[model samples]
Target: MNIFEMLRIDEGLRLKIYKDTEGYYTIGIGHLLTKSPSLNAAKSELDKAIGRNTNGVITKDEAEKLFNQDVDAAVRGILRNAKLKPVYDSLDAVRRAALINMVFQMGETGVAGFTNSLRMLQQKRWDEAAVNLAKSRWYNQTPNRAKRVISTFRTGTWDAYK
Candidate 1:
């Protein structure tokens, strides 16, 4: 599958308002609404995100727009980041997809904090990079997703999906 499709699968479709793993109210395809002015504001936005109210829900189209927007933010964030762009540009498509997955999961600054792993990725030392990632709190908190990301980093393919 393509990167966006893969992310949709990895992130899963959440139409109704629900607390994410981090306990923030989220909607659509991993869209975080916790940053709203208040819970009331987020509630209104959630209804907007879903496109119809009666239930906290999102149509595929509504979800699609937010999903694309969120994904683009992650990619463009990396594109402009001084710390990561050079290393990010050096990687192949699969590895590049892996980086986007991470930046989407954690934020640009969070992924940039992976100094040793990013360095290993820059050198194309896949095993070392995977090992470095495996040792982190991220791996501990979300082993399944983190493992998949690490697999993508090492194999340079969608082995993570398999």
Candidate 2:
């Protein structure tokens, strides 16, 4: 019922820096590329002050707000793409989550470029789609994580590989 709960369900929570869909460095519920100068400054000072290369944590409230913004924007991007929208909507929850996960990893525009894979999705060719995904550059770049996603499509189950 809470916004934070939805975000935890949708995007998962992480309090540290990690690469995002487009391979940009991100942190704190998908804050991309240190967009806040003040936060970056604070991180620099904290790193020097503590003699360690780390910043600190944001409160749950902060993360929830950011996740709201991020997921909204991501959904918007997905909708704006003509090819992705109907296919996205037609999928069952598991497949929908798989698409969103791919969008999160590669971004809307990036995922848009997967013409063949998208075609397989539109046709509901799960095995072919998974195979197409496996042969993609994204698979090559992030093999470990990609397997979980491909398996989700292949098995029609959430958390299939994880």
Candidate 3:
């Protein structure tokens, strides 16, 4: 089990367009088409990549492809933060994976606002960091995913993937 397993389980792949919990048009493993300037533009981009006009439908392989792109984008976004860079680098692989998972769902800017949590993580206060994460609105919004990620962070283990 790894990042792919955790994210795929949390995001849940969909080949057809559907409204997410937040009412945004999303598809292909949590890819927010609404963020692409417009849903039509998003379809066009995917259509081009998949070598056909999907008309809002995609293949499992296409969703798998987009999943990698999404993960890469999230990973890059996390490291791009000045304060987060060193802190992220200091963590174990499982803990780092947790941050990327949080960034994937909560968005980079939202996760960046967790100043107290970030400080706890940076100071290696695993328990406090988990508490900080658990207390967030993000956690309240998606308790299942949060519980897994927070457990990984606090324990510095990949037990969540089990």
Question: Best candidate, lDDT-wise?
Answer: 1
Per-candidate clashes come to 0, 2, 0
lDDT of 1 by residue, 1-162 (tens): 678977887789877777778777787788887764466666787776556562566678888888998999999999999978988999999889989999998999999999988889999999988999999999998899899989999999897786
Off by over 4 Å in 3: 35-51
**Residues 1-162 of candidate 3: C-alpha lDDT, one tens digit per residue:** 688888998888899987787777788898877654467877776677667888999989888988999899988887888867877888888888888888888788888889999999999999988888888888888788789888999998888768
Off by over 4 Å in 1: 35-41, 47-55
Per-residue lDDT over 1-162 for candidate 2, one digit per residue giving the tens place of the 0 to 100 score = 232333354445666655565554555655564434455654664344335565565556655666667667777888888988988887887777678777765679889999998889889899999888898887887676788778877877755433
For all predictions, the C-alpha RMSD in Å is 2.3, 6.4, 2.2
lDDT of 2: 0.68
Off by over 4 Å in 2: 1-24, 34-57, 159-162
